[PDB]
Design a protein around this ligand. Structure first.
Ligand SMILES: O[C@H](c1cc(C(F)(F)F)nc2c(C(F)(F)F)cccc12)[C@@H]1CCCCN1
Ligand SMILES: [Mg+2]
Ligand SMILES: [Mg+2]
Ligand SMILES: [Mg+2]
Ligand SMILES: [Mg+2]
Ligand SMILES: [Mg+2]
Ligand SMILES: [Mg+2]
Ligand SMILES: [Mg+2]
Ligand SMILES: [Mg+2]
Ligand SMILES: [Mg+2]
Ligand SMILES: [Mg+2]
Ligand SMILES: [Mg+2]
Ligand SMILES: [Mg+2]
Ligand SMILES: [Mg+2]
Ligand SMILES: [Mg+2]
Ligand SMILES: [Mg+2]
Ligand SMILES: [Mg+2]
Ligand SMILES: [Mg+2]
Ligand SMILES: [Mg+2]
Ligand SMILES: [Mg+2]
Ligand SMILES: [Mg+2]
Ligand SMILES: [Mg+2]
Ligand SMILES: [Mg+2]
Ligand SMILES: [Mg+2]
Ligand SMILES: [Mg+2]
Ligand SMILES: [Mg+2]
Ligand SMILES: [Mg+2]
Ligand SMILES: [Mg+2]
Ligand SMILES: [Mg+2]
Ligand SMILES: [Mg+2]
Ligand SMILES: [Mg+2]
Ligand SMILES: [Mg+2]
Ligand SMILES: [Mg+2]
Ligand SMILES: [Mg+2]
Ligand SMILES: [Mg+2]
Ligand SMILES: [Mg+2]
Ligand SMILES: [Mg+2]
Ligand SMILES: [Mg+2]
Ligand SMILES: [Mg+2]
Lengths: 170, 125
RNA sequence: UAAAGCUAAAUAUAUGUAGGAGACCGAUAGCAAACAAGUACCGUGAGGGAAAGAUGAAAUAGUACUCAGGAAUGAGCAAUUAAAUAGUACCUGAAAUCGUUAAGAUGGAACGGAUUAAGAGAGAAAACAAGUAAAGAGGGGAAU
RNA sequence: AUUUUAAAAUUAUUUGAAUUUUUCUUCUUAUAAUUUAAGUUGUUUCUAUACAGUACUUUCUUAACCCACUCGUCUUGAAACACGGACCAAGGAGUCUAGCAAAUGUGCAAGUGUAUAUGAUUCUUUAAACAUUUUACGCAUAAUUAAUG
RNA sequence: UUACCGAUACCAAGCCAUAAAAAGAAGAAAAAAUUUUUUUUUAGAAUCUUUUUAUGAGUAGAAAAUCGUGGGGUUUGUGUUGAAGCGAAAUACGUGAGUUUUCGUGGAACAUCUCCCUAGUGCAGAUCUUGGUGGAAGUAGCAACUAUUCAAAU
RNA sequence: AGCGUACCAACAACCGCAUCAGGUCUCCAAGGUUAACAGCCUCUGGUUAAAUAGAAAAAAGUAGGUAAGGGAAGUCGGCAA
RNA sequence: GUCAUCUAAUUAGUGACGCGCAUGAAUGGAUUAACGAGAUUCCCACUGUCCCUACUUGCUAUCUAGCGAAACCACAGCCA
RNA sequence: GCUGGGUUUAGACCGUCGUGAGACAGGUUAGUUUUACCCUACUGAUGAAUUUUAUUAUAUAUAUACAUAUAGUA
RNA sequence: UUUUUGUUUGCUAAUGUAAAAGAGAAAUUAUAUAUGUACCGGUACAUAAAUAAUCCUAUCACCUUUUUCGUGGCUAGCUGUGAGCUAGGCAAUAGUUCUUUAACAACAAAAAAGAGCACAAACUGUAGACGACUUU
């Protein structure tokens, strides 16, 4: 994992190797999640899956609509990336399980590192124009998630000068 | 600008970076001299990168002296250390980057015996 | 001494096989082909014609087991190894590109040069202290 | 390590002159010193009674003042409303031989080059190195003429 | 009528290179200590050293000095107490190509500047080749064939 | 005697670089309306699928409709309807 | 091109005229019923062609879930 | 943005010119009008942020910029 | 509001100033004249006329003794602050400068004292591509 941890005893990690979900949506979801208690994050994910709360598309915001729920994050654009959300939820669950297996309280766990890297594209073919074959590739991803339990010089002359200054002030 | 320290004068502390090395990744900073019409650098327009030139060179007398005032000498072995027994105030040892730790230590020890300065004693320390 | 003929040797070999070589090439190089290459695949056909090597000393060390998972996978207080960010897409793993974190900047570009500045890192081999003394740890060389 | 000397100048002396009678009057006889000669040395701090700090060095970072137009390219002229360039990595272009030339190096020199080829007590390297029979040929040493010459 | 500001031009000084010119095959100086120790040097590399003066634009081009890469002969070395490489650097050196070093990775080779020998020897461009990767962009779009819906099962 | 005998025949099995609205030969051929193997609807057989669904129902587009009074005054031209 | 004709008006159309830059006889000339997805003009019918646009329907566009390209691109992107 | 009637591709006809292929700044007819999803511009549609920033006064005739100002909604 | 110390896992104590060294200064108005003042724009009398070439405000530390006057508080006295007068003779020494650490504003901690909205969701349709708006 990418993060500098020091003590892995208070941390619980979870990974997703090559996910069949779009890199951008998933990234957005991750961003939305970040710096949150694990349970709260899970709840948020659930809500998004049921189309109650949206994730704000702030980075990859090209063409994404203009939802009502985006006002919650001071933004205008937002979406409900279902499959991606589900994937993320699964990973969260895994992380939770891992934590349980150790000795970490799930209530005091915060997501300290939610990384989404883009995996190698799954190549497919699309057919265009005047007999033209074009790449119809997917954008798979790796997801890395880390949860964590959260609760000169003197100089004599210089000294003299300082003293003088003090005296002056007085 | 100019960087006087002792009698040691350095005319140009800044590196001369290649033209446009800051504009395209593919172009490294390593100085290359621009050729061809319409260079701007070649033509020396105000505001562009400067062209390294012989005027910049350091006085023949202090040239390869480092801040210490000693010419740096690279050392791979004790035998090599030895040419500088009669020169401890004028050349300073640097131990080769590829020397194994024991050998380095030995070299350092030798240097101390000789009173010769080591500029990189701390490698693998 | 024509209008009949034969005849070994030296001489030539980018073909084939078999040897031996190099101041040769080192996987975009070298044969097209270091690998199930004239193979896959394309062309009605004559023809055209690739890409693709490397884990480790040893897989007779190729991931046991536990937990979460529909499963993949993940995680481990677990496990092979010297080493798994050597996990079979496996040596090294650059750049473009992208992610996380931090710092900073931001009124229709950005970067840059010249000169400072404030930060933020780095550093002591010029950037102070030779020697003298008390006593430890070492190393030597010589004299007889 | 003798032009950081010699002289100039200046200071305190010493002998003789001068018309500019003058505590900087000049020459000159002699001796010491000094610097106005003969390119900056001294005093006191500070860093500092420090081993790296917030000081000092330097890399990066933005600022800020002033400046700064996309490079390559063909062109009288490119920032061009000229073309090529999305980006990056690797590959990617005056070479090799034949004969001639001048340049220069080297050996030999009216010669020179041992060509093929032979010979060896030569055989991992040895496809090189060595050796050249107990008037070869090249180029040069002579030119000139269509030509017998 | 002055005064002032104002160039890479001019002047004064330094330093760098180039060109030329002078010229060159033996010796103790000082300081610190306390008369003797300690601290520095004690030079002589002919394309070299010392000094002097003048000069320094530059495309096409020419030349010289360097620098680096793959291999060779020679030379003296570095490696599992970790080589090459790679990434970041560095009170680093060089005008500069670069060189050298530190940390991290790496896990096996690597140099030569001692001389010179050889080359398939240096890239930002060629609508360059090959392989990769972007912004465009989570956008265009996934609109012929009249049309689906409910319940259950897996 | 031997050989062929599955299945597809395009709707995704063929050729169109593809599970591409294209192309590709032949036979069988129901009721109604009707001149009609036309078109429209139905029975037998076959599907209810087609590189997507859902929600909204702006502009704009595209395939359509319909427009008072006028009737080519539009436009190169009654093109289109 | 002049006279007619068609129109409220005609560089069009038709019928004449003809010293015709440069028409003309199988380079076929002149005339022709029928035929033509032929070229041209006028008339009637008919209409959103137009006056003068309006409303409306499917399918797209639109938003969502899912998936998901490309051309192009020196860097980029306000003007006088 | 359209239209494509002409001009200015290939088909074709006539006239003149050319031995001819063909020529015509002579005539006549038939002849594919591709792409916005980029940036800006414009038209509309949301919408944060804004202390070296503000202030035409405030306060009980006197004061005070050597001063006020939070913010969030509406 | 006052005081104290500080600002020498991504965090969980916290710093920034285009400008402090006295950053001192409120008639108005004309420019071939103004300003006051007193009467009825007019008259008379003053006044500025190098107007910031000025004026104001600085340094009197100390504590104690003899006080005087002003201002602010509470029920003539008391206390605090500012200014003068009189007496006591008292203090600062950093070894020659290296900013004269002296301002403003924000904070953070410590003690002390006092005292609900909005979005969504459903609904709406005066709105509308989606937001947004209009509603409930
Ligand atoms: O020219 C002399 C000299 C002599 C000799 C010697 F005679 F020994 F061969 N050799 C010299 C050399 C040398 F030849 F290399 F030995 C160089 C320079 C000077 C040399 C110098 C004179 C100055 C002192 C050094 N030797
Ligand atoms: Mg030019
Ligand atoms: Mg140019
Ligand atoms: Mg024969
Ligand atoms: Mg190959
Ligand atoms: Mg080891
Ligand atoms: Mg590794
Ligand atoms: Mg290996
Ligand atoms: Mg690897
Ligand atoms: Mg400018
Ligand atoms: Mg031109
Ligand atoms: Mg061209
Ligand atoms: Mg281009
Ligand atoms: Mg290219
Ligand atoms: Mg290359
Ligand atoms: Mg010659
Ligand atoms: Mg020059
Ligand atoms: Mg190397
Ligand atoms: Mg080459
Ligand atoms: Mg390149
Ligand atoms: Mg080039
Ligand atoms: Mg390519
Ligand atoms: Mg059958
Ligand atoms: Mg069957
Ligand atoms: Mg089909
Ligand atoms: Mg085919
Ligand atoms: Mg289909
Ligand atoms: Mg009508
Ligand atoms: Mg009518
Ligand atoms: Mg008309
Ligand atoms: Mg009209
Ligand atoms: Mg029609
Ligand atoms: Mg008409
Ligand atoms: Mg007629
Ligand atoms: Mg004729
Ligand atoms: Mg016909
Ligand atoms: Mg692309
Ligand atoms: Mg046309
Ligand atoms: Mg034609």
């Amino acid at each position: 994992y990418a993060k500098k941890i020091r003590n892995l005893g208070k941390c619980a990690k979870g990974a997703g190797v090559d996910l069949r979900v779009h890199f951008k949506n998933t990234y957005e979801a991750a961003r939305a999640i970040r710096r949150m208690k694990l349970l709260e994050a899970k709840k948020y994910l659930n809500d998004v899956i049921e189309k109650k709360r949206c994730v704000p598309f702030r980075k990859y915001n090209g063409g994404v609509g203009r939802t009502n729920q985006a006002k919650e994050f001071n933004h205008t654009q937002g979406r409900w990336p279902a499959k991606s959300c589900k994937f993320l939820l699964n990973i969260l669950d895994n992380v939770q399980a891992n934590a349980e297996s150790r000795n970490l309280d799930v209530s005091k766990l915060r997501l300290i590192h939610v990384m989404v890297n883009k995996a190698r594209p799954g190549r497919r073919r699309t057919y265009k124009a005047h007999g033209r074959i074009n790449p119809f590739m997917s954008s798979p991803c790796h997801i890395q998630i880390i949860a964590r339990e959260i609760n000169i010089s003197n100089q004599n002359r210089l000294k003299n000068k300082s003293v003088k200054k003090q005296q002056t002030v007085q | 600008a100019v960087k006087k320290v002792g009698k040691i004068i350095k005319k140009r502390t800044k590196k001369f970076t290649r033209f446009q090395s800051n504009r395209f990744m593919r172009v490294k900073p390593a100085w290359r001299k621009p050729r061809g019409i319409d260079c701007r650098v070649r033509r020396r327009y105000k505001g562009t990168n400067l062209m390294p030139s012989i005027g910049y060179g350091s006085n023949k007398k202090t040239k390869f002296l480092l801040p210490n005032n000693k010419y740096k000498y690279v050392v791979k072995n004790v035998k090599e250390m030895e040419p500088l027994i009669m020169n401890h105030t004028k050349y300073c040892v640097q131990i080769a980057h590829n020397v194994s730790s024991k050998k380095r230590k030995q070299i350092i020890e030798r240097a101390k015996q000789m009173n010769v300065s080591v500029i990189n004693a701390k490698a693998r320390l």
